[PDB]
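Need tokens for this chain, all 256 residues.
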Amino acid sequence: MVLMTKPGTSDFVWNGIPLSMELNLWNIKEYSGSVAMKFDGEKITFDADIQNLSPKEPERYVLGYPEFYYGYKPWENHTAEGSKLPVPVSSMKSFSVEVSFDIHHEPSLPLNFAMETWLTREKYQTEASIGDVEIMVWFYFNNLTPGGEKIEEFTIPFVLNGESVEGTWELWLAEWGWDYLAFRLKDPVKKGRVKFDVRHFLDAAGKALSSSARVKDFEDLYFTVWEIGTEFGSPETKSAQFGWKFENFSIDLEVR
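Here are the structure tokens for all 256 residues:
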């Protein structure tokens, strides 16, 4: 059983998959109150009841991203042992991810349920820079918009509660120190079970970026990690009360 009550990272294994969970308050300079993250063999839960918040850098907008991930997170220079990632984007035939979730929050709190990867030029960077890409997939949001600007929409299928559906996803693009792409489901889901193939988002991203002058050789970048969590807060958020539960996690990475 894993229990954390302060910012930090612990590795664990769930359904035979080696994973990391991070009680991630990366952009929070100070806070009072309580946070707790737990993995009990069947589920991962996170709860926060915090006040007196202020950001380290308001320019990053959100305050934190409690999450768990598969693979190598560059910014943390960390991966649990046993992960098949990182791998070149081109070598990924498919990558299915499935999880069920239940999110709760006080109504006013900016928050999303978002998964993400980082595509980098070298296999094990400790940062993302020009030439690299951050890609997020947002299934839920409340009082929070992705960064950058909305440029397109894509129809991409996924399985929602066991039913195969066609979702409409907005693609938001930002050119920061790296390229930021966020696909945002237009009909947000606060609770349910989803399964989809990450390769669909990577193919949509390769096209969106096909005429880029910063990102070269997209399919040769390393697909480093798959993070699943909830970003929350804005530069004005003073307190945050919210929590979630994730269950039924599985993946199927098919590598060329």
